[PDB]
Amino acid sequence: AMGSMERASLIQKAKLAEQAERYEDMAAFMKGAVEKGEELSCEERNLLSVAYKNVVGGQRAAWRVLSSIEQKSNGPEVREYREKVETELQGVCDTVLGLLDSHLIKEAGDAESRVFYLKMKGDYYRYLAEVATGDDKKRIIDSARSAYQEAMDISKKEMPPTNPIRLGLALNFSVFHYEIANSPEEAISLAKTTFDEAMADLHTLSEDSYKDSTLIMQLLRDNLTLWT
């Protein structure tokens, strides 16, 4: 629905929607910007990620509320409404995955952009895996794993251990291991090794980069504290 708006106006409006906490608008504006067919800048990739993370985050929180009510109960209303929210969430994940496939990932040549999009791909398959129960559930889990793994391989070859996207990717892959793949030891090992190798690289950073990296290291430590 955004084809008649200028790319720069879509970007401007996405920033306004973020300030207004109108994340569904924000996501639609950024979807329109992606569909212009040009690659996304660092800041623009951030806007895309923030928009859809907020949208799906609200759907995931609602799905978890309804799922717990449904479990406590087990007429059809709780199941029906959980299924409605679940279908809406799957639609948003499919939309994001479609933007990544057409054609963000194939046009992403630099390590920073390619790792960013593969992390997104892993995240949205992870969100699909959280609600999955059928024939394709193992394939959904393996799609998340495969996206995260490729992003990790690139990030380890091409980025310093303190790079925020490398740190965030390792954080989320470790959550995938703990929550989705039932591999808590892998989750813990990944979080520890990521934290320790980042610690040893902080000395190379400016004060502003140091602030960015240690913020994400604290999330790794929070999980390690929760898990051990």
């Binding site: 923030v50 993370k53 965030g168 954080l171 989320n172 959550v175 999330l219 999980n223 898990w227």
Partner: peptide
């Protein structure tokens, strides 16, 4: 329960 990346 665990933290994934967030701003």
């Amino acid at each position: 329960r665990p933290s994934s990346w967030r701003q």
